[PDB]
Amino acid sequence: ASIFRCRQCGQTISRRDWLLPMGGDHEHVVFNPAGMIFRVWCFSLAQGLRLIGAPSGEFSWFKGYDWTIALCGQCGSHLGWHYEGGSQPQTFFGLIKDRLAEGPA
Ligand SMILES: CC[C@@]1(C)CC(=O)NC1=O
Ligand SMILES: [Zn+2]
Numbered sequence: 478a479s480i481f482r483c484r485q486c487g488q489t490i491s492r493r494d495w496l497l498p499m500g501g502d503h504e505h506v507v508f509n510p511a512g513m514i515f516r517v518w519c520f521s522l523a524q525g526l527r528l529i530g531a532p533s534g535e536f537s538w539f540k541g542y543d544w545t546i547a548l549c550g551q552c553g554s555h556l557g558w559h560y561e562g563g564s565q566p567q568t569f570f571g572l573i574k575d576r577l578a579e580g581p582a
Contacts (some may be wrong), residue, residue, distance in 0.1 A: 481527070481577040486552035490577060491523040497569050499539065503572070507538045517557065517571040525550050526570075528559050538571070539563070547572070 481491045496503040497519040503518045527550040532543035542563040549556050557572035
C-alpha cells in the first residue's frame, strides 16, 4: 500500500512518499460552508488531476493559500484541492482521503 488511486476509476494520483505534514500533520479534518466534513490528506505532489478555474482565497483552510478545485482527470470525481500562492511550500495538494484507494505501486 504505497500509491493512491482515484477510488471511482483507478487513475493514479499520488504516493505515500509524497505525504506532506502541514502544520505538523498530514491529516486535517475540516468543514466547508455547506457543512460537509472532509478528512484531507496533504501531499507535496500529485498527478492525474484536472484543476478547475482560477485560484481563490475565500474560506481557505490553510492560511496564505489560495485553492483551486482538483478533479480526477480521468473520471471527473472531486478528489480535493490544489493550494498555491503561499510560503514553504508555495504549493501543495489537499486530497480527500476516502475518495482515494491505497495499494501497491
Ligand atoms: C469553499 C472552498 C473549500 C471547500 C476549500 C477550502 O480550503 N476551504 C473550503 O471550505
Ligand atoms: Zn477517477
